[PDB]
Amino acid sequence: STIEERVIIGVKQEEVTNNFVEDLGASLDTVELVMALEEEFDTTTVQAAIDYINGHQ
Template identity: 50%
Template structure:
């Protein structure tokens, strides 16, 4: 899976979980500041990413995951191609 494919899948999950407009979801978009996610939204988003990509995201990594790109980078680094 390419980075672009991963990005598009993450973007779709973010749109569904956060109800964000497609044009607001950029690689640099901050989940809380730009996409208005609250703590429950973040938990649900992390769970959805774990399920979609069959990857475990530890709490400390989830807390550090602030942007769409940081989620993409973590998934690429921690999944088998």
């Protein structure tokens, strides 16, 4: 599970471009996402699948 391979993070594998609310389509749907990624790392776009969650912890 690489930096891109791990970040868990409703979308088709291919459609989910490493490029959440707008294009990717990842009210409360976006909230349980953080809660799920927060658990497995024990720590606008889909940019944080690399930016926020690699440097931090």
